[PDB]
Amino acid sequence: KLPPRVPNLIPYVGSFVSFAKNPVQFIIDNSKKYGDVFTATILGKEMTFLNHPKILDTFFKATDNELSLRDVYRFMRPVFGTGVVYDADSTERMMEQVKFVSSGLTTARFRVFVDIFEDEIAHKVKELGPEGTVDVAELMADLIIFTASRCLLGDEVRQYLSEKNLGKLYHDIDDGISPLSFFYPSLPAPKRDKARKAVGEIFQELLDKRREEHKKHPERLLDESKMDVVDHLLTQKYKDGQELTDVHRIGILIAGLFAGQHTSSITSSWTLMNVISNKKVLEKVRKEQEEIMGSDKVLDYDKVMKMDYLEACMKEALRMYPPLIMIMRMARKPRECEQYIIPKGNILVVSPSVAGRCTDTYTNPDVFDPERLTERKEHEKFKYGAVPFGAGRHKCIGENFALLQVKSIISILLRYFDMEYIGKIPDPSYTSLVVGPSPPTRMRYKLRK
Ligand code: HEM
Numbered sequence: 070k071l072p073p074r075v076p077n078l079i080p081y082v083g084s085f086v087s088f089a090k091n092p093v094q095f096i097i098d099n100s101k102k103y104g105d106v107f108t109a110t111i112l113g114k115e116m117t118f119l120n121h122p123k124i125l126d127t128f129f130k131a132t133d134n135e136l137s138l139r140d141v142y143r144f145m146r147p148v149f150g151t152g153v154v155y156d157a158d159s160t161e162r163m164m165e166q167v168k169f170v171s172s173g174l175t176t177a178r179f180r181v182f183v184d185i186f187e188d189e190i191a192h193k194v195k196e197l198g199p200e201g202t203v204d205v206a207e208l209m210a211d212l213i214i215f216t217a218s219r220c221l222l223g224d225e226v227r228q229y230l231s232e233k234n235l236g237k238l239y240h241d242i243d244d245g246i247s248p249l250s251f252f253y254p255s256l257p258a259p260k261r262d263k264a265r266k267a268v269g270e271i272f273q274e275l276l277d278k279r280r281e282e283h284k285k286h287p288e289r290l291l292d293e294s295k296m297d298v299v300d301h302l303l304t305q306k307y308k309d310g311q312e313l314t315d316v317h318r319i320g321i322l323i324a325g326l327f328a329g330q331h332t333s334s335i336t337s338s339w340t341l342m343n344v345i346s347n348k349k350v351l352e353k354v355r356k357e358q359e360e361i362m363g364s365d366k367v368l369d370y371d372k373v374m375k376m377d378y379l380e381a382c383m384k385e386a387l388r389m390y391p392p393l394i395m396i397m398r399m400a401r402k403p404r405e406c407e408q409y410i411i412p413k414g415n416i417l418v419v420s421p422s423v424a425g426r427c428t429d430t431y432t433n434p435d436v437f438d439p440e441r442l443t444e445r446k447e448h449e450k451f452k453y454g455a456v457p458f459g460a461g462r463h464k465c466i467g468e469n470f471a472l473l474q475v476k477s478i479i480s481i482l483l484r485y486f487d488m489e490y491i492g493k494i495p496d497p498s499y500t501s502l503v504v505g506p507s508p509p510t511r512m513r514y515k516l517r518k
């Protein structure tokens with residue numbers, strides 16, 4: 070009962086050549102040809118693609134012993150660190166590591182995060198001056214490396230970003246990893262090794278400093294508005310009693326910071342580009358902002374939580390340009406999928422990119438149209454019609470933080486600046502792990518009157 074196959078052009082390499090040109094177009098073309106589920110061989114991996122919202126239950130509902138996240142990347146050279154994330158000894162242990170991070174994402178902390186957004190943009194606004202042009206993707210990456218770093222690690226990290234080039238070494242954690250790195254065998258990567266070592270030494274020092282801060286001010290552990298992911302990694306332990314090492318704490322922090330940064334900076338870029346390019350969307354965004362802000366001058370938590378239309382704009386950006394283009398699981402046993410059984414050892418693939426352009430879900434899906442959500446509720450037609458943050462067990466735990474961070478940053482930029490996008494909104498570039506717009510993305514800005 071095998072799903073239909075994409076015919077191998079060559080043995081072993083299989084469909085890799087057309088997949089490598091464009092992974093999203095590959096899944097779109099082969100969906101049209103072969104239906105809601107199909108298999109391709111790609112450099113010796115059996116890849117089974119699930120393409121229609123009506124059949125995604127069997128992917129998202131599975132237990133870790135049926136469809137395995139850990140198995141997809143457990144033989145990967147650890148980008149984050151040994152024994153953390155997909156290198157952890159178990160899925161249960163990975164979920165304890167996820168909890169160390171999610172512990173830092175409370176309402177009490179979200180209230181402080183808004184203050185941190187205002188502070189970082191106020192520094193940035195001074196650099197930008199009264200008017201100019203700025204790369205949108207670079208602006209958003211540079212803002213969120215400061216905001217995400219402070220929100221998750223606390224304000225002691227800032228000195229290392231301003232003075233010790235934590236930013237530079239962080240940008241290389243990623244180095245040479247494209248969405249095709251998964252299929253090529255293990256190469257060397259000394260640049261990445263130098264990055265992780267460098268970030269590791271900075272994170273070791275933050276841990277050492279925070280231990281001394283705990284001894285001087287233990288009442289910190291009672292303050293939900295101060296407790297960050299560093300505090301949680303120093304205070305929490307594994308269920309099974311095995312030691313949480315500083316090696317683990319550093320890898321989990323790098324992995325937390327990577328998650329908290331790339332996806333937010335890219336989504337922020339797409340959302341602002343599309344908002345400022347559409348007269349009616351910009352009108353309603355600024356009307357919402359004007360209503361929420363009243364005669365107040367700065368954001369707080371309750372204001373951001375009201376910004377429903379700016380939230381739809383970001384979810385519309387997430388529909389059209391999801392920064393994670395494939396969600397993958399390893400079949401540890403045969404998986405039923407409609408009339409088919411997907412074989413043991415196949416990797417199942419769900420693509421937010423393909424989900425976002427599904428005409429069964431969304432009308433005129435190449436048009437940025439936030440009202441498709443607020444008015445027509447197109448995201449609600451299917452349970453799995455919108456999956457930019459995934460679903461089930463491994464759903465993003467960062468969703469509310471990402472919404473808070475991107476909505477705040479865009480609200481505050483619109484408060485300071487009139488902004489115009491230079492040229493055509495580009496296509497996504499499928500050349501990085503977290504995919505964002507084709508590089509040249511410039512906008513004009515001018516201080517508002
Ligand atoms: C717009 C920004 C974001 C997008 C689009 C996004 C997307 C996703 C998606 C699709 C998944 C599911 C992956 C899978 O099923 O295999 C996921 C998982 C995850 N995300 Fe995010 N994410 C975002 C922001 C964040 C942030 C800001 C954090 C942390 C501060 C975060 C932490 C995580 C974690 C820990 C998981 C794994 C949960 C688990 O394995 O059980 N994400 N994210």
Ligand SMILES: O=C(N[C@@H](Cn1ccnc1)c1c(F)cc(-c2ccc(F)cc2)cc1F)c1ccc(-c2nnc(-c3ccccc3)o2)cc1
Binds near residue numbers: 142167252332465
């Ligand atoms: O970072 C990855 N996934 C992201 C996706 N993300 C972002 C925001 N929300 C979810 C991710 C993440 F960065 C961190 C976490 C996480 C964070 C903290 C924890 F405690 C536990 C998990 C989860 C995640 F899912 C990731 C990293 C490496 C790879 C990978 N794919 N191929 C290679 C590879 C490397 C080399 C050669 C050959 C291949 O590496 C794939 C995905």
